[PDB]
Ligand binder design. Structure first.
Ligand SMILES: [Pt+2]
Ligand SMILES: [Sm+3]
Ligand SMILES: [Sm+3]
Ligand SMILES: [Sm+3]
Ligand SMILES: [Sm+3]
Length: 275
């Protein structure tokens, strides 16, 4: 059902890509390292690697992350009460001008979900958005989060072009999941979450890089449940995105979905920019 097209590495004005960003929900940093996730990254050779759901719990990170001379500047954020839940990471070849954490909203900053890395010509934000939960028990909160996240990004974007990436926990449109009819009342595809995504795009403003480039391509997913071998039947959801300021659209070369990369229930996504 899906084969990501070849990497286009020149922007529309012919400028070659100078920045390769990779984002990946690793479903557990160590479990992922064990599944050989780091080798795939070594092959991808991105300049910036953004990781979501690291689930780290101790006073030390895996030694394997010290073997990356190409992604030597590493930033991490895990829950205040760090216990195998959530957690994000941002590893960069070059040193950002500034790395901050959270969105400046206490009640939304206790779960190690956001890292902001400011660069010369843009600000990068990696996020692991709160899942609405089984039985939608956390849907009211998620709407409060969406609202606060949106407003934070709108403010960052007002000072410098923005690139948001990560596992945003929402398949925006019907084309973003294999079973839209059966999930309208499940976390990730509720009207509230879909509205929230559409509202993020409108308010910042932000453009969905992959959909902007492949507006009619179906079956492009970044997550398949481990249950019932959904990855092999390509029964999935597109939950990971690279959202960008409109001002960055002429620098956009390509937004990829590395469907073949194993190591998690999410596959990595990659962005090429000519800055
Ligand atoms: Pt199934
Ligand atoms: Sm998970
Ligand atoms: Sm508040
Ligand atoms: Sm529609
Ligand atoms: Sm340049």
């Amino acid at each position: 059902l899906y084969e990501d097209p070849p990497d286009q590495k020149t922007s529309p004005s012919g400028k070659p890509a100078t920045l390769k960003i990779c984002s990946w929900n690793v479903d557990g940093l160590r479990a992922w390292i064990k599944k050989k996730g780091l080798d795939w990254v070594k092959e991808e050779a991105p300049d910036i690697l953004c990781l979501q759901e690291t689930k780290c719990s101790e006073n030390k990170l895996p030694a394997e992350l010290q073997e990356l001379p190409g992604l030597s500047h590493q930033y991490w954020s895990a829950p205040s009460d760090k216990e195998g839940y959530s957690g994000v990471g941002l590893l960069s070849r070059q040193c950002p001008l500034k790395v901050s954490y959270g969105i400046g909203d206490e009640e939304h900053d206790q779960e190690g979900r956001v890292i902001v890395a400011e660069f010369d010509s843009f600000v990068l934000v990696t996020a692991y958005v709160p899942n609405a939960g089984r039985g939608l028990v956390r849907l009211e909160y998620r709407q409060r989060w969406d609202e606060a996240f949106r407003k934070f990004l709108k403010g960052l974007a007002s000072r410098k072009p923005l690139v948001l990436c990560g596992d945003l926990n929402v398949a925006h449109e019907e084309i973003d999941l294999r079973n839209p009819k059966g999930n309208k009342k499940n976390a990730g595809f509720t009207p509230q979450e879909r509205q929230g995504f559409g509202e993020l795009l409108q308010a910042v403003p932000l453009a969905d890089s992959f959909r902007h480039l492949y507006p009619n391509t179906p079956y492009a997913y970044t997550f398949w449940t481990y249950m019932m071998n959904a990855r092999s039947k390509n029964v999935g959801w597109r939950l990971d995105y690279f959202l960008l300021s409109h001002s960055l659209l002429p620098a956009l070369c390509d937004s990829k979905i590395r469907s073949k990369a194993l190591g998690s229930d999410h596959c990595p996504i990659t962005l090429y920019l000519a800055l």
